[PDB]
Write a protein that holds these residues in place. Structure first.
Motif, PDB file in Angstrom:
ATOM      1  N   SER A 177      60.184  48.491  52.589  1.00  0.00           N
ATOM      2  CA  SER A 177      60.550  48.986  53.912  1.00  0.00           C
ATOM      3  C   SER A 177      60.845  47.851  54.883  1.00  0.00           C
ATOM      4  CB  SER A 177      59.438  49.872  54.467  1.00  0.00           C
ATOM      5  OG  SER A 177      59.845  50.479  55.678  1.00  0.00           O
ATOM      6  N   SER A 181      69.055  53.542  52.843  1.00  0.00           N
ATOM      7  CA  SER A 181      69.958  52.841  53.749  1.00  0.00           C
ATOM      8  C   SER A 181      71.042  53.768  54.283  1.00  0.00           C
ATOM      9  CB  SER A 181      70.586  51.643  53.039  1.00  0.00           C
ATOM     10  OG  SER A 181      69.655  50.584  52.925  1.00  0.00           O
ATOM     11  N   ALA A 232      65.289  61.291  56.777  1.00  0.00           N
ATOM     12  CA  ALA A 232      65.224  60.278  57.821  1.00  0.00           C
ATOM     13  C   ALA A 232      65.297  60.987  59.162  1.00  0.00           C
ATOM     14  CB  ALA A 232      66.360  59.258  57.696  1.00  0.00           C
ATOM     15  N   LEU A 244      71.307  57.851  60.768  1.00  0.00           N
ATOM     16  CA  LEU A 244      70.341  58.058  61.841  1.00  0.00           C
ATOM     17  C   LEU A 244      70.611  57.122  63.011  1.00  0.00           C
ATOM     18  CD1 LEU A 244      67.376  59.764  61.735  1.00  0.00           C
ATOM     19  CD2 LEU A 244      66.598  57.416  62.145  1.00  0.00           C
ATOM     20  N   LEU A 245      70.872  55.845  62.723  1.00  0.00           N
ATOM     21  CA  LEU A 245      71.008  54.852  63.784  1.00  0.00           C
ATOM     22  C   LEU A 245      72.295  55.042  64.578  1.00  0.00           C
ATOM     23  CD1 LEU A 245      69.640  51.796  61.813  1.00  0.00           C
ATOM     24  CD2 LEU A 245      68.584  52.928  63.781  1.00  0.00           C
ATOM     25  N   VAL A 288      61.759  57.104  57.551  1.00  0.00           N
ATOM     26  CA  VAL A 288      62.601  57.418  56.398  1.00  0.00           C
ATOM     27  C   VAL A 288      61.742  57.423  55.138  1.00  0.00           C
ATOM     28  CG1 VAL A 288      63.276  54.991  56.235  1.00  0.00           C
ATOM     29  CG2 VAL A 288      64.627  56.732  55.046  1.00  0.00           C
ATOM     30  N   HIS A 307      64.530  47.579  56.602  1.00  0.00           N
ATOM     31  CA  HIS A 307      64.678  47.586  58.054  1.00  0.00           C
ATOM     32  C   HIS A 307      65.353  46.312  58.544  1.00  0.00           C
ATOM     33  CE1 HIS A 307      61.818  50.964  57.896  1.00  0.00           C
ATOM     34  NE2 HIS A 307      62.247  51.251  59.112  1.00  0.00           N
ATOM     35  N   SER A 328      61.641  55.691  64.484  1.00  0.00           N
ATOM     36  CA  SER A 328      62.387  56.114  63.308  1.00  0.00           C
ATOM     37  C   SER A 328      61.498  56.111  62.070  1.00  0.00           C
ATOM     38  CB  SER A 328      63.588  55.195  63.073  1.00  0.00           C
ATOM     39  OG  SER A 328      63.177  53.837  63.000  1.00  0.00           O
ATOM     40  N   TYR A 347      69.413  56.053  56.905  1.00  0.00           N
ATOM     41  CA  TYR A 347      69.092  55.319  58.125  1.00  0.00           C
ATOM     42  C   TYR A 347      70.352  54.934  58.888  1.00  0.00           C
ATOM     43  CZ  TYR A 347      64.447  53.787  59.727  1.00  0.00           C
ATOM     44  OH  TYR A 347      63.222  53.695  60.349  1.00  0.00           O
ATOM     45  N   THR A 348      71.409  54.535  58.175  1.00  0.00           N
ATOM     46  CA  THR A 348      72.656  54.189  58.849  1.00  0.00           C
ATOM     47  C   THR A 348      73.187  55.369  59.654  1.00  0.00           C
ATOM     48  OG1 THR A 348      73.170  52.624  57.076  1.00  0.00           O
ATOM     49  CG2 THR A 348      74.973  53.277  58.528  1.00  0.00           C
ATOM     50  N   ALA A 385      60.181  50.945  64.523  1.00  0.00           N
ATOM     51  CA  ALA A 385      59.607  51.344  63.244  1.00  0.00           C
ATOM     52  C   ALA A 385      58.189  50.802  63.142  1.00  0.00           C
ATOM     53  CB  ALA A 385      60.453  50.834  62.075  1.00  0.00           C
TER      54      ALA A 385
END
Ligand code: COA
Ligand code: COA
Ligand code: BNG
Ligand code: PPQ
Ligand code: PPQ
Lengths: 175, 174
Positions: free
Chosen positions: A127, A98, A66, A104-105, A85, A131, A83, A101-102, A118
């Protein structure tokens, strides 16, 4: 159980293998030509200090990536990130996407970005629902934006907004 | 004079026009004025696959209309992005829409699938020119840019053509 960590140049051959599988087998990615590991390494080195690039190691193997990058190379967009992933096709639906991404965010938010965008090649229910489960809101859709795999495919924009004042401070690098 | 294909000699004038909107408006999200060679490098790289047109008044460049790739992934190759700028004085003399019309008729003839316009908002003039030419509003990103003391949204407008399947390679401008 997956070790989420920063991506290195040694992870890129594995990352390239994963994404190349989806380039060839799916319309999730609008590339029509496989990539080489060095092209991945070039983007990482150029972006990893300014945008988070994360891999998920499982039993010693790279199971997903990601990463983030710029939305558009004009200065007003500097607080807008894009972003991405990808999870290996044998480790799907185990929570890696998930989890990646968590992480990453939270980095993007702590760094001081305004929003994360995205770009999803449709159809792509896995996806879209991932998202939207993480707070991304649908924003737009371009019709027949790409021709891949013998058909025209729409592309959709999803956006996750953070709160920044006026004016915003320059965003922090990852470190 | 009038409307014609853009040349390398026109780029300084084009750069002066667009820099005016970079420095005074939010219709384009650059904050740093440009230099004519960045236009020249793009012209030479693209002028054979995409139409690059300038309008002249009194033998002087008064506006540019050009197209280029939307995104550098091959599936997008039949999707073009369009842009048009008219000099501050020549606004509302039919130059913009006339420039855009010739740009669009070339893109349709070359075999593109659609044309996308990215408009920094607020921009009522551009929104109206585009929708008057058949563009449909297709999306909007919230607070996508910060410029001149405020957050600004950006909207996407799209003009759809129709192609056979599988689509043939886009014809060059020549
Ligand atoms: C999209 C992707 C990253 C999801 O990651 P994942 O690890 O497989 O999914 P997760 O285990 O993290 O699950 C999170 C949510 O994603 C959704 N989701 C994931 N796979 C799904 C599937 N086949 N069908 C429907 N929803 C799905 C679910 O809403 C899920 O929530 P839940 O598990 O609590 O029910 C993964 O499917 C993938 O790699 N696809 C191919 C590449 C790709 O499409 N990347 C996205 C580019 S826009
Ligand atoms: C937007 C622009 C190209 C319009 O072209 P123009 O030559 O100025 O206007 P035209 O006479 O050719 O007609 C274009 C149509 O757009 C609308 N329009 C043009 N200028 C307008 C203005 N100041 N206010 C409201 N509507 C306007 C009108 O509907 C007009 O049709 P009309 O003549 O019947 O009123 C030009 O004004 C410009 O360069 N603006 C600043 C740069 C810009 O916004 N570029 C958009 C990139 S997305
Ligand atoms: C619009 C030019 C596309 C150049 C960028 C993509 C490079 C790889 C594929 O190129 C192809 O080249 C043709 C031009 O002859 C296009 O018509 C066709 O759609 C496109 O698939
Ligand atoms: C449809 P696209 O190829 O433009 C982007 C797909 C995916 N979000 C990614 O970032 O790879
Ligand atoms: C708001 P933006 O800077 O992304 C694009 C503005 C205009 N469409 C252009 O192409 O110059």
């Amino acid at each position: 159980p997956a070790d989420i960590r920063r991506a290195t140049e040694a992870d890129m051959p594995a990352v390239c293998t994963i994404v190349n599988h989806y380039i060839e087998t799916s319309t999730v990615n609008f590339r029509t030509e496989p990539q080489e590991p060095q092209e991945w390494t070039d983007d990482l080195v150029r972006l990893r200090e300014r945008y988070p690039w994360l891999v998920a190691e499982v039993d010693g193997e790279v199971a997903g990536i990601a990463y983030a990058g710029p939305w558009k190379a004009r200065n007003a967009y500097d607080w807008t990130a894009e972003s991405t992933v990808y999870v290996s096709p044998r480790h799907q639906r185990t929570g890696l996407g998930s989890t990646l991404y968590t992480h990453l965010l939270k980095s993007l938010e702590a760094q001081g970005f305004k929003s994360v965008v995205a770009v999803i090649g449709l159809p792509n229910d896995p996806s879209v629902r991932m998202h939207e489960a993480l707070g991304y809101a649908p924003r737009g859709m371009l019709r027949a934006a790409g021709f891949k795999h013998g058909n025209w495919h729409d592309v959709g924009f999803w956006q996750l907004d953070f709160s920044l004042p006026v004016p915003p401070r320059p965003v922090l690098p990852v470190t």
